[PDB]
Amino acid sequence: SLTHRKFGGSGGSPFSGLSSIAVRSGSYLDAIIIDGVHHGGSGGNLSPTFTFGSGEYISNMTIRSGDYIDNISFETNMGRRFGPYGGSGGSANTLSNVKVIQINGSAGDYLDSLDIYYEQY
Amino acid sequence: SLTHRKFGGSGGSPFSGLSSIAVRSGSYLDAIIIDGVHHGGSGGNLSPTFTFGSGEYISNMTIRSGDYIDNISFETNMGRRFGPYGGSGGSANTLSNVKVIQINGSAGDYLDSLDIYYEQY
Ligand SMILES: OC[C@H]1O[C@H](O[C@H]2[C@H](O)[C@@H](O)[C@H](O)O[C@@H]2CO)[C@H](O)[C@@H](O)[C@@H]1O
Ligand SMILES: OC[C@H]1O[C@H](O[C@H]2[C@H](O)[C@@H](O)[C@H](O)O[C@@H]2CO)[C@H](O)[C@@H](O)[C@@H]1O
Ligand SMILES: OC[C@H]1O[C@H](O[C@H]2[C@H](O)[C@@H](O)[C@H](O)O[C@@H]2CO)[C@H](O)[C@@H](O)[C@@H]1O
Ligand SMILES: OC[C@H]1O[C@H](O[C@H]2[C@H](O)[C@@H](O)[C@H](O)O[C@@H]2CO)[C@H](O)[C@@H](O)[C@@H]1O
Ligand SMILES: OC[C@H]1O[C@H](O[C@H]2[C@H](O)[C@@H](O)[C@H](O)O[C@@H]2CO)[C@H](O)[C@@H](O)[C@@H]1O
Ligand SMILES: OC[C@H]1O[C@H](O[C@H]2[C@H](O)[C@@H](O)[C@H](O)O[C@@H]2CO)[C@H](O)[C@@H](O)[C@@H]1O
Ligand SMILES: [Mg+2]
Ligand SMILES: [Mg+2]
């Protein structure tokens, strides 16, 4: 059962473990790069890195996928945009009015799949 | 209390976003370093970095806390432990028979709070 629990006090500035994202892309997502950790292969070209602010999170996202992840775009709650990066294959699926918590997946020479954990609002 | 969705195909090798953890600690946790990214202050002493292996996840965790995070220790499904790090203040809470998915929190000069996202078995 998926859940969360908070320990500690009320001080400080919020942070997420998911602190930055970049991709390598061409026709597909060759790689997704999460906090600088690379998942996938070395093809395509490297995107800029998106670094989240305190309290900033992915609120909406569009993922195109087939056998692999074709394309990623997202928007944050601060209205900032990442992508689209990738190609035009697959079909699109969207998350709307969410808070993304984690990005897991599977990768080889490319990014095969994503398993996105999020809160739905 | 949260959900997940999968996108893409069945190829490649699985990965988890949460792949390394270190802390700075004294009396409290001054900081937590997740996938290399520093959250918190510059006090205390830097712990070794725990780098997760293939198929490894936190299955047991004990956090002491009050206004801040006083102490952390955890064990993985593969029997590999981190800590205890920190002090003996606050009060203790344990999660067990879990799979930790993400660590968020809040931090200033110290680690004020941790929000642990997990599957509960
Ligand atoms: O993102 C995957 C690759 O995209 C491009 O590769 C294309 C290539 O441009 C095209 O001639 C060929 O027919 O298809 C491949 C993809 O299957 C990039 O040039 C590569 O760097 C990427 O790996
Ligand atoms: O998500 C990537 C692409 O997945 C499918 O393409 C497969 C195709 O099904 C298979 O016959 C061929 O051998 O491999 C390609 C991927 O290289 C979708 O049909 C495409 O729309 C996607 O771009
Ligand atoms: O991420 C896409 C696939 O990557 C790998 O497949 C490679 C294979 O390792 C290599 O020997 C061959 O030359 O190219 C293929 C990619 O076409 C993984 O082994 C697959 O599981 C992934 O789907
Ligand atoms: O982990 C927080 C800090 O713990 C110690 O600081 C102590 C200090 O040793 C003691 O003299 C004072 O009375 O209390 C503070 C904590 O409130 C470490 O020495 C520091 O490096 C840490 O930042
Ligand atoms: O988690 C850190 C400590 O939090 C509390 O101590 C606070 C106390 O609540 C506050 O009134 C005072 O001003 O600061 C101290 C921190 O030194 C818990 O009572 C302690 O057990 C915790 O160690
Ligand atoms: O993480 C503990 C707190 O760190 C900062 O608090 C500072 C504050 O900025 C400074 O003016 C004062 O002198 O010291 C405290 C540390 O106790 C954050 O601003 C707080 O939100 C955190 O709780
Ligand atoms: Mg408490
Ligand atoms: Mg400050």
mmCIF file of C-alpha atoms and ligand atoms in Angstrom:
data_model
loop_
_atom_site.group_PDB
_atom_site.id
_atom_site.type_symbol
_atom_site.label_atom_id
_atom_site.label_comp_id
_atom_site.label_asym_id
_atom_site.label_seq_id
_atom_site.Cartn_x
_atom_site.Cartn_y
_atom_site.Cartn_z
ATOM 1 C CA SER A 1 0.000 0.000 0.000
ATOM 2 C CA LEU A 2 1.520 3.309 -1.061
ATOM 3 C CA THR A 3 1.735 5.938 1.603
ATOM 4 C CA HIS A 4 3.937 8.568 3.262
ATOM 5 C CA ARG A 5 4.754 9.756 6.684
ATOM 6 C CA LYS A 6 6.374 12.971 7.897
ATOM 7 C CA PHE A 7 8.745 13.098 10.888
ATOM 8 C CA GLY A 8 10.183 16.233 12.466
ATOM 9 C CA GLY A 9 9.151 19.775 12.930
ATOM 10 C CA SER A 10 7.717 22.628 10.970
ATOM 11 C CA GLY A 11 10.923 24.601 10.162
ATOM 12 C CA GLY A 12 13.133 24.804 7.160
ATOM 13 C CA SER A 13 12.756 25.043 3.447
ATOM 14 C CA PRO A 14 11.000 22.222 1.594
ATOM 15 C CA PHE A 15 12.996 19.973 -0.633
ATOM 16 C CA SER A 16 12.351 16.956 -2.847
ATOM 17 C CA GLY A 17 14.574 14.042 -3.385
ATOM 18 C CA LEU A 18 13.701 14.580 -7.031
ATOM 19 C CA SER A 19 15.796 17.744 -7.313
ATOM 20 C CA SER A 20 16.742 17.846 -11.069
ATOM 21 C CA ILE A 21 15.933 16.296 -14.386
ATOM 22 C CA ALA A 22 17.592 16.197 -17.777
ATOM 23 C CA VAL A 23 17.310 13.944 -20.756
ATOM 24 C CA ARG A 24 19.368 12.637 -23.691
ATOM 25 C CA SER A 25 17.114 12.552 -26.694
ATOM 26 C CA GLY A 26 16.818 12.086 -30.380
ATOM 27 C CA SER A 27 13.865 10.168 -31.876
ATOM 28 C CA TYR A 28 13.398 8.678 -28.381
ATOM 29 C CA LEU A 29 14.543 9.345 -24.909
ATOM 30 C CA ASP A 30 18.004 7.773 -24.913
ATOM 31 C CA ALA A 31 18.256 8.501 -21.240
ATOM 32 C CA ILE A 32 16.605 10.225 -18.348
ATOM 33 C CA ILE A 33 18.938 11.830 -15.836
ATOM 34 C CA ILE A 34 17.598 12.154 -12.298
ATOM 35 C CA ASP A 35 19.715 14.183 -9.851
ATOM 36 C CA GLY A 36 22.526 13.647 -12.309
ATOM 37 C CA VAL A 37 22.148 9.868 -12.214
ATOM 38 C CA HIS A 38 21.954 8.505 -15.789
ATOM 39 C CA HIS A 39 19.354 5.920 -16.859
ATOM 40 C CA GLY A 40 19.703 4.753 -20.477
ATOM 41 C CA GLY A 41 22.380 5.017 -23.132
ATOM 42 C CA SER A 42 24.735 7.543 -24.563
ATOM 43 C CA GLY A 43 22.982 8.444 -27.823
ATOM 44 C CA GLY A 44 21.025 11.573 -28.646
ATOM 45 C CA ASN A 45 21.875 15.012 -27.325
ATOM 46 C CA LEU A 46 21.832 16.235 -23.802
ATOM 47 C CA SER A 47 19.137 18.634 -22.745
ATOM 48 C CA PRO A 48 19.614 21.471 -20.224
ATOM 49 C CA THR A 49 19.098 20.426 -16.638
ATOM 50 C CA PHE A 50 15.901 21.480 -14.928
ATOM 51 C CA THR A 51 16.516 22.141 -11.219
ATOM 52 C CA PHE A 52 13.485 22.423 -8.985
ATOM 53 C CA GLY A 53 12.970 25.242 -6.484
ATOM 54 C CA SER A 54 11.866 24.772 -2.816
ATOM 55 C CA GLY A 55 8.236 23.811 -2.933
ATOM 56 C CA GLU A 56 8.409 23.321 -6.779
ATOM 57 C CA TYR A 57 7.139 20.142 -8.252
ATOM 58 C CA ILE A 58 5.793 18.643 -11.527
ATOM 59 C CA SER A 59 2.062 19.435 -11.632
ATOM 60 C CA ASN A 60 1.298 18.193 -15.142
ATOM 61 C CA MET A 61 3.123 16.037 -17.671
ATOM 62 C CA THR A 62 2.790 14.524 -21.119
ATOM 63 C CA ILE A 63 4.616 11.318 -21.953
ATOM 64 C CA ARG A 64 4.641 9.791 -25.394
ATOM 65 C CA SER A 65 5.459 6.084 -25.393
ATOM 66 C CA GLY A 66 5.373 2.823 -27.351
ATOM 67 C CA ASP A 67 7.975 0.142 -26.807
ATOM 68 C CA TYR A 68 10.114 2.984 -25.384
ATOM 69 C CA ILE A 69 9.585 6.496 -24.027
ATOM 70 C CA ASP A 70 9.355 8.673 -27.155
ATOM 71 C CA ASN A 71 8.926 12.099 -25.575
ATOM 72 C CA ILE A 72 8.609 13.897 -22.261
ATOM 73 C CA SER A 73 7.218 17.364 -21.409
ATOM 74 C CA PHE A 74 6.190 18.733 -18.086
ATOM 75 C CA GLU A 75 5.068 21.815 -16.247
ATOM 76 C CA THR A 76 5.665 22.724 -12.631
ATOM 77 C CA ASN A 77 3.405 24.383 -10.048
ATOM 78 C CA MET A 78 5.527 27.549 -10.566
ATOM 79 C CA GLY A 79 4.507 27.516 -14.184
ATOM 80 C CA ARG A 80 7.916 26.514 -15.556
ATOM 81 C CA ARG A 81 8.133 24.163 -18.524
ATOM 82 C CA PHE A 82 10.516 21.378 -19.487
ATOM 83 C CA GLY A 83 10.528 20.048 -23.016
ATOM 84 C CA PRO A 84 9.041 18.591 -25.098
ATOM 85 C CA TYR A 85 12.166 16.520 -25.726
ATOM 86 C CA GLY A 86 12.145 13.493 -27.938
ATOM 87 C CA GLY A 87 10.373 12.314 -31.061
ATOM 88 C CA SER A 88 6.787 12.102 -32.255
ATOM 89 C CA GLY A 89 6.186 8.282 -32.053
ATOM 90 C CA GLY A 90 4.095 6.305 -29.610
ATOM 91 C CA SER A 91 0.991 7.737 -28.182
ATOM 92 C CA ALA A 92 0.475 10.412 -25.612
ATOM 93 C CA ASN A 93 -0.669 10.015 -22.028
ATOM 94 C CA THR A 94 -1.024 12.803 -19.510
ATOM 95 C CA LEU A 95 -0.950 13.484 -15.750
ATOM 96 C CA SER A 96 -3.000 16.553 -14.765
ATOM 97 C CA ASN A 97 -3.164 18.384 -11.389
ATOM 98 C CA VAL A 98 -0.654 16.112 -9.647
ATOM 99 C CA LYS A 99 2.401 16.318 -7.508
ATOM 100 C CA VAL A 100 5.125 14.010 -8.838
ATOM 101 C CA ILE A 101 7.069 12.348 -6.030
ATOM 102 C CA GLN A 102 9.391 9.851 -7.813
ATOM 103 C CA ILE A 103 10.468 8.650 -11.202
ATOM 104 C CA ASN A 104 11.534 4.984 -11.467
ATOM 105 C CA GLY A 105 11.667 3.009 -14.722
ATOM 106 C CA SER A 106 13.618 0.618 -16.905
ATOM 107 C CA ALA A 107 16.439 1.413 -19.304
ATOM 108 C CA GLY A 108 18.842 -0.156 -21.715
ATOM 109 C CA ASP A 109 20.379 1.639 -24.681
ATOM 110 C CA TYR A 110 17.218 3.758 -24.433
ATOM 111 C CA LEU A 111 14.627 4.638 -21.826
ATOM 112 C CA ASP A 112 12.165 1.713 -22.093
ATOM 113 C CA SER A 113 9.673 2.637 -19.447
ATOM 114 C CA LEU A 114 8.839 5.010 -16.616
ATOM 115 C CA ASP A 115 7.022 4.222 -13.396
ATOM 116 C CA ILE A 116 5.833 7.576 -12.029
ATOM 117 C CA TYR A 117 4.744 7.914 -8.410
ATOM 118 C CA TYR A 118 2.572 10.921 -7.724
ATOM 119 C CA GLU A 119 -0.208 12.441 -5.663
ATOM 120 C CA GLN A 120 -3.449 13.099 -7.568
ATOM 121 C CA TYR A 121 -5.278 16.317 -6.728
ATOM 122 C CA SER B 1 -2.307 7.969 -0.218
ATOM 123 C CA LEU B 2 -0.520 8.279 -3.480
ATOM 124 C CA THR B 3 -0.464 6.347 -6.739
ATOM 125 C CA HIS B 4 1.725 5.351 -9.637
ATOM 126 C CA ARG B 5 1.414 4.855 -13.370
ATOM 127 C CA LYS B 6 3.642 3.037 -15.851
ATOM 128 C CA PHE B 7 4.452 4.170 -19.367
ATOM 129 C CA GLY B 8 6.444 2.382 -22.120
ATOM 130 C CA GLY B 9 7.510 -1.163 -22.962
ATOM 131 C CA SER B 10 8.849 -4.213 -21.236
ATOM 132 C CA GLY B 11 12.543 -3.990 -22.116
ATOM 133 C CA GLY B 12 15.611 -2.774 -20.301
ATOM 134 C CA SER B 13 16.786 -3.031 -16.722
ATOM 135 C CA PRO B 14 14.822 -1.577 -13.748
ATOM 136 C CA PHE B 15 16.067 1.439 -11.896
ATOM 137 C CA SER B 16 15.013 3.384 -8.847
ATOM 138 C CA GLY B 17 15.383 7.127 -8.509
ATOM 139 C CA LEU B 18 16.574 6.704 -4.916
ATOM 140 C CA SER B 19 20.152 5.440 -5.351
ATOM 141 C CA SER B 20 22.455 6.995 -2.745
ATOM 142 C CA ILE B 21 22.202 8.543 0.654
ATOM 143 C CA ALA B 22 24.697 10.235 3.015
ATOM 144 C CA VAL B 23 24.176 12.564 5.983
ATOM 145 C CA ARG B 24 25.936 15.178 8.022
ATOM 146 C CA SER B 25 25.370 14.669 11.710
ATOM 147 C CA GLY B 26 26.193 15.873 15.196
ATOM 148 C CA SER B 27 23.604 16.040 17.904
ATOM 149 C CA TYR B 28 21.081 16.122 15.030
ATOM 150 C CA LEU B 29 21.026 15.504 11.335
ATOM 151 C CA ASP B 30 22.512 18.628 9.825
ATOM 152 C CA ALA B 31 21.832 17.482 6.263
ATOM 153 C CA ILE B 32 20.800 14.629 4.040
ATOM 154 C CA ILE B 33 22.459 14.107 0.720
ATOM 155 C CA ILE B 34 20.276 12.305 -1.818
ATOM 156 C CA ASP B 35 21.821 11.105 -5.094
ATOM 157 C CA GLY B 36 24.614 13.532 -4.449
ATOM 158 C CA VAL B 37 22.399 16.609 -3.869
ATOM 159 C CA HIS B 38 22.862 18.325 -0.478
ATOM 160 C CA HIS B 39 19.876 19.275 1.615
ATOM 161 C CA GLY B 40 20.605 21.145 4.836
ATOM 162 C CA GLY B 41 23.506 22.739 6.571
ATOM 163 C CA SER B 42 27.255 22.484 6.797
ATOM 164 C CA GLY B 43 27.562 21.500 10.472
ATOM 165 C CA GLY B 44 28.243 18.055 11.842
ATOM 166 C CA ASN B 45 30.362 15.424 10.241
ATOM 167 C CA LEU B 46 29.882 13.761 6.862
ATOM 168 C CA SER B 47 28.913 10.084 6.946
ATOM 169 C CA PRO B 48 30.002 7.550 4.335
ATOM 170 C CA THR B 49 27.746 7.365 1.313
ATOM 171 C CA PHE B 50 25.450 4.456 1.031
ATOM 172 C CA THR B 51 25.067 3.506 -2.592
ATOM 173 C CA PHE B 52 22.149 1.181 -3.328
ATOM 174 C CA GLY B 53 22.882 -2.039 -5.265
ATOM 175 C CA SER B 54 20.832 -3.741 -7.910
ATOM 176 C CA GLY B 55 17.468 -4.725 -6.500
ATOM 177 C CA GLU B 56 18.107 -3.018 -3.155
ATOM 178 C CA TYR B 57 15.671 -0.862 -1.187
ATOM 179 C CA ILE B 58 15.181 0.341 2.371
ATOM 180 C CA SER B 59 12.953 -2.135 4.226
ATOM 181 C CA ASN B 60 13.380 -0.963 7.837
ATOM 182 C CA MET B 61 14.051 2.546 9.146
ATOM 183 C CA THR B 62 14.236 4.144 12.563
ATOM 184 C CA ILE B 63 14.052 7.936 12.867
ATOM 185 C CA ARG B 64 14.399 9.853 16.086
ATOM 186 C CA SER B 65 12.822 13.323 15.887
ATOM 187 C CA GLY B 66 11.453 16.285 17.766
ATOM 188 C CA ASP B 67 11.662 19.775 16.242
ATOM 189 C CA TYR B 68 14.362 18.375 13.912
ATOM 190 C CA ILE B 69 15.576 14.973 12.825
ATOM 191 C CA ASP B 70 17.720 13.728 15.670
ATOM 192 C CA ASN B 71 18.911 10.415 14.226
ATOM 193 C CA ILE B 72 18.431 8.037 11.302
ATOM 194 C CA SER B 73 19.255 4.395 10.771
ATOM 195 C CA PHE B 74 18.023 1.980 8.121
ATOM 196 C CA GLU B 75 18.413 -1.546 6.787
ATOM 197 C CA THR B 76 17.837 -2.737 3.275
ATOM 198 C CA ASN B 77 16.236 -5.922 1.890
ATOM 199 C CA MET B 78 19.829 -7.189 1.350
ATOM 200 C CA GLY B 79 20.731 -6.693 5.002
ATOM 201 C CA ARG B 80 22.897 -3.673 4.453
ATOM 202 C CA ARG B 81 22.645 -0.950 7.044
ATOM 203 C CA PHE B 82 23.244 2.746 7.389
ATOM 204 C CA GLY B 83 23.753 4.398 10.734
ATOM 205 C CA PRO B 84 22.700 5.117 13.367
ATOM 206 C CA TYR B 85 23.733 8.668 12.732
ATOM 207 C CA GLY B 86 22.873 11.599 14.952
ATOM 208 C CA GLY B 87 22.003 12.031 18.594
ATOM 209 C CA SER B 88 19.755 10.474 21.165
ATOM 210 C CA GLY B 89 17.247 13.312 21.434
ATOM 211 C CA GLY B 90 13.691 13.371 20.194
ATOM 212 C CA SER B 91 11.592 10.220 20.200
ATOM 213 C CA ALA B 92 11.827 7.163 18.013
ATOM 214 C CA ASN B 93 9.547 5.882 15.325
ATOM 215 C CA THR B 94 10.215 2.744 13.223
ATOM 216 C CA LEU B 95 8.937 1.709 9.790
ATOM 217 C CA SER B 96 9.235 -1.964 9.071
ATOM 218 C CA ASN B 97 8.325 -4.341 6.270
ATOM 219 C CA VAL B 98 8.360 -1.374 3.868
ATOM 220 C CA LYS B 99 9.907 -0.476 0.456
ATOM 221 C CA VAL B 100 10.991 3.176 0.555
ATOM 222 C CA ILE B 101 10.289 4.919 -2.749
ATOM 223 C CA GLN B 102 11.310 8.545 -2.038
ATOM 224 C CA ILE B 103 12.620 10.883 0.591
ATOM 225 C CA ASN B 104 11.456 14.504 0.652
ATOM 226 C CA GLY B 105 11.752 16.857 3.636
ATOM 227 C CA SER B 106 12.495 20.333 4.835
ATOM 228 C CA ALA B 107 15.860 21.721 5.830
ATOM 229 C CA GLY B 108 17.570 24.869 6.996
ATOM 230 C CA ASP B 109 20.765 24.837 9.050
ATOM 231 C CA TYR B 110 19.577 21.395 10.138
ATOM 232 C CA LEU B 111 17.292 18.737 8.789
ATOM 233 C CA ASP B 112 13.955 19.845 10.172
ATOM 234 C CA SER B 113 11.825 17.077 8.721
ATOM 235 C CA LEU B 114 11.667 14.039 6.460
ATOM 236 C CA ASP B 115 8.713 12.880 4.462
ATOM 237 C CA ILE B 116 9.172 9.250 3.656
ATOM 238 C CA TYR B 117 7.227 7.743 0.750
ATOM 239 C CA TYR B 118 6.937 4.014 0.873
ATOM 240 C CA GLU B 119 5.037 0.794 0.164
ATOM 241 C CA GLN B 120 3.798 -0.809 3.357
ATOM 242 C CA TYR B 121 3.710 -4.635 3.440
HETATM 243 O O1 LIG C 1 16.897 8.814 -29.674
HETATM 244 C C1 LIG C 1 17.287 7.671 -30.402
HETATM 245 C C2 LIG C 1 18.250 8.079 -31.511
HETATM 246 O O2 LIG C 1 17.678 9.127 -32.261
HETATM 247 C C3 LIG C 1 18.451 9.455 -33.393
HETATM 248 O O3 LIG C 1 18.688 8.250 -34.164
HETATM 249 C C4 LIG C 1 17.907 7.919 -35.290
HETATM 250 C C5 LIG C 1 18.643 8.345 -36.554
HETATM 251 O O4 LIG C 1 18.638 9.752 -36.648
HETATM 252 C C6 LIG C 1 17.994 7.750 -37.797
HETATM 253 O O5 LIG C 1 18.835 7.956 -38.910
HETATM 254 C C7 LIG C 1 17.755 6.257 -37.614
HETATM 255 O O6 LIG C 1 17.101 5.738 -38.749
HETATM 256 O O7 LIG C 1 16.957 6.053 -36.472
HETATM 257 C C8 LIG C 1 17.629 6.418 -35.287
HETATM 258 C C9 LIG C 1 16.779 6.025 -34.085
HETATM 259 O O8 LIG C 1 16.282 4.719 -34.268
HETATM 260 C C10 LIG C 1 19.793 10.019 -32.942
HETATM 261 O O9 LIG C 1 20.591 10.301 -34.069
HETATM 262 C C11 LIG C 1 20.515 9.026 -32.040
HETATM 263 O O10 LIG C 1 21.647 9.642 -31.468
HETATM 264 C C12 LIG C 1 19.589 8.528 -30.936
HETATM 265 O O11 LIG C 1 20.199 7.449 -30.265
HETATM 266 O O1 LIG C 2 8.206 3.748 -28.365
HETATM 267 C C1 LIG C 2 9.110 3.580 -29.434
HETATM 268 C C2 LIG C 2 8.357 3.050 -30.651
HETATM 269 O O2 LIG C 2 7.667 1.875 -30.285
HETATM 270 C C3 LIG C 2 7.048 1.252 -31.390
HETATM 271 O O3 LIG C 2 7.969 0.932 -32.427
HETATM 272 C C4 LIG C 2 8.626 -0.315 -32.430
HETATM 273 C C5 LIG C 2 7.851 -1.289 -33.309
HETATM 274 O O4 LIG C 2 6.656 -1.658 -32.656
HETATM 275 C C6 LIG C 2 8.667 -2.539 -33.612
HETATM 276 O O5 LIG C 2 8.038 -3.272 -34.638
HETATM 277 C C7 LIG C 2 10.082 -2.174 -34.045
HETATM 278 O O6 LIG C 2 10.836 -3.348 -34.240
HETATM 279 O O7 LIG C 2 10.685 -1.382 -33.048
HETATM 280 C C8 LIG C 2 10.055 -0.128 -32.928
HETATM 281 C C9 LIG C 2 10.855 0.750 -31.973
HETATM 282 O O8 LIG C 2 12.169 0.901 -32.459
HETATM 283 C C10 LIG C 2 5.963 2.165 -31.947
HETATM 284 O O9 LIG C 2 5.379 1.571 -33.085
HETATM 285 C C11 LIG C 2 6.538 3.526 -32.319
HETATM 286 O O10 LIG C 2 5.482 4.413 -32.612
HETATM 287 C C12 LIG C 2 7.370 4.088 -31.174
HETATM 288 O O11 LIG C 2 8.073 5.228 -31.621
HETATM 289 O O1 LIG C 3 16.748 0.190 -24.162
HETATM 290 C C1 LIG C 3 16.473 -0.484 -25.371
HETATM 291 C C2 LIG C 3 17.056 -1.890 -25.302
HETATM 292 O O2 LIG C 3 18.420 -1.802 -24.947
HETATM 293 C C3 LIG C 3 19.072 -3.054 -24.937
HETATM 294 O O3 LIG C 3 19.201 -3.761 -26.145
HETATM 295 C C4 LIG C 3 20.335 -3.561 -26.959
HETATM 296 C C5 LIG C 3 21.328 -4.699 -26.750
HETATM 297 O O4 LIG C 3 21.888 -4.611 -25.459
HETATM 298 C C6 LIG C 3 22.441 -4.638 -27.788
HETATM 299 O O5 LIG C 3 23.225 -5.808 -27.715
HETATM 300 C C7 LIG C 3 21.865 -4.494 -29.190
HETATM 301 O O6 LIG C 3 22.914 -4.366 -30.122
HETATM 302 O O7 LIG C 3 21.039 -3.353 -29.244
HETATM 303 C C8 LIG C 3 19.903 -3.480 -28.419
HETATM 304 C C9 LIG C 3 18.975 -2.294 -28.649
HETATM 305 O O8 LIG C 3 18.359 -2.416 -29.911
HETATM 306 C C10 LIG C 3 18.434 -3.959 -23.889
HETATM 307 O O9 LIG C 3 19.052 -5.226 -23.912
HETATM 308 C C11 LIG C 3 16.941 -4.108 -24.151
HETATM 309 O O10 LIG C 3 16.340 -4.819 -23.091
HETATM 310 C C12 LIG C 3 16.302 -2.731 -24.279
HETATM 311 O O11 LIG C 3 14.954 -2.863 -24.668
HETATM 312 O O1 LIG C 4 24.090 18.201 14.733
HETATM 313 C C1 LIG C 4 23.978 19.551 15.126
HETATM 314 C C2 LIG C 4 25.287 20.002 15.765
HETATM 315 O O2 LIG C 4 25.624 19.098 16.795
HETATM 316 C C3 LIG C 4 26.780 19.484 17.507
HETATM 317 O O3 LIG C 4 26.643 20.816 18.022
HETATM 318 C C4 LIG C 4 26.366 20.898 19.402
HETATM 319 C C5 LIG C 4 27.613 21.367 20.141
HETATM 320 O O4 LIG C 4 28.589 20.350 20.113
HETATM 321 C C6 LIG C 4 27.288 21.722 21.587
HETATM 322 O O5 LIG C 4 28.392 22.377 22.170
HETATM 323 C C7 LIG C 4 26.063 22.625 21.661
HETATM 324 O O6 LIG C 4 25.736 22.871 23.010
HETATM 325 O O7 LIG C 4 24.976 22.002 21.015
HETATM 326 C C8 LIG C 4 25.202 21.855 19.632
HETATM 327 C C9 LIG C 4 23.932 21.341 18.962
HETATM 328 O O8 LIG C 4 22.837 22.136 19.356
HETATM 329 C C10 LIG C 4 27.982 19.453 16.572
HETATM 330 O O9 LIG C 4 29.137 19.863 17.270
HETATM 331 C C11 LIG C 4 27.744 20.372 15.381
HETATM 332 O O10 LIG C 4 28.783 20.209 14.441
HETATM 333 C C12 LIG C 4 26.404 20.052 14.728
HETATM 334 O O11 LIG C 4 26.105 21.032 13.758
HETATM 335 O O1 LIG C 5 14.549 17.387 17.443
HETATM 336 C C1 LIG C 5 15.392 18.278 18.140
HETATM 337 C C2 LIG C 5 14.870 18.470 19.558
HETATM 338 O O2 LIG C 5 13.554 18.979 19.504
HETATM 339 C C3 LIG C 5 13.043 19.298 20.780
HETATM 340 O O3 LIG C 5 13.826 20.303 21.489
HETATM 341 C C4 LIG C 5 13.656 21.673 21.200
HETATM 342 C C5 LIG C 5 12.513 22.235 22.039
HETATM 343 O O4 LIG C 5 11.289 21.699 21.588
HETATM 344 C C6 LIG C 5 12.470 23.755 21.946
HETATM 345 O O5 LIG C 5 11.563 24.262 22.899
HETATM 346 C C7 LIG C 5 13.850 24.350 22.189
HETATM 347 O O6 LIG C 5 13.798 25.749 22.027
HETATM 348 O O7 LIG C 5 14.768 23.799 21.273
HETATM 349 C C8 LIG C 5 14.956 22.418 21.484
HETATM 350 C C9 LIG C 5 16.081 21.916 20.587
HETATM 351 O O8 LIG C 5 17.283 21.868 21.324
HETATM 352 C C10 LIG C 5 12.921 18.023 21.606
HETATM 353 O O9 LIG C 5 12.447 18.338 22.897
HETATM 354 C C11 LIG C 5 14.271 17.328 21.713
HETATM 355 O O10 LIG C 5 14.106 16.066 22.319
HETATM 356 C C12 LIG C 5 14.887 17.155 20.329
HETATM 357 O O11 LIG C 5 16.215 16.700 20.460
HETATM 358 O O1 LIG C 6 17.026 23.997 10.152
HETATM 359 C C1 LIG C 6 16.842 24.702 11.359
HETATM 360 C C2 LIG C 6 16.408 26.130 11.048
HETATM 361 O O2 LIG C 6 17.358 26.725 10.188
HETATM 362 C C3 LIG C 6 17.072 28.080 9.918
HETATM 363 O O3 LIG C 6 16.907 28.841 11.152
HETATM 364 C C4 LIG C 6 17.961 29.666 11.593
HETATM 365 C C5 LIG C 6 17.621 31.122 11.294
HETATM 366 O O4 LIG C 6 17.677 31.344 9.902
HETATM 367 C C6 LIG C 6 18.593 32.063 11.994
HETATM 368 O O5 LIG C 6 18.118 33.387 11.895
HETATM 369 C C7 LIG C 6 18.747 31.685 13.461
HETATM 370 O O6 LIG C 6 19.702 32.523 14.070
HETATM 371 O O7 LIG C 6 19.165 30.343 13.557
HETATM 372 C C8 LIG C 6 18.179 29.450 13.086
HETATM 373 C C9 LIG C 6 18.617 28.018 13.370
HETATM 374 O O8 LIG C 6 17.997 27.560 14.550
HETATM 375 C C10 LIG C 6 15.757 28.180 9.159
HETATM 376 O O9 LIG C 6 15.461 29.532 8.888
HETATM 377 C C11 LIG C 6 14.636 27.559 9.983
HETATM 378 O O10 LIG C 6 13.448 27.523 9.225
HETATM 379 C C12 LIG C 6 15.027 26.146 10.399
HETATM 380 O O11 LIG C 6 14.073 25.641 11.307
HETATM 381 MG MG MG C 7 7.309 14.716 16.398
HETATM 382 MG MG MG C 8 18.934 30.117 6.214
#
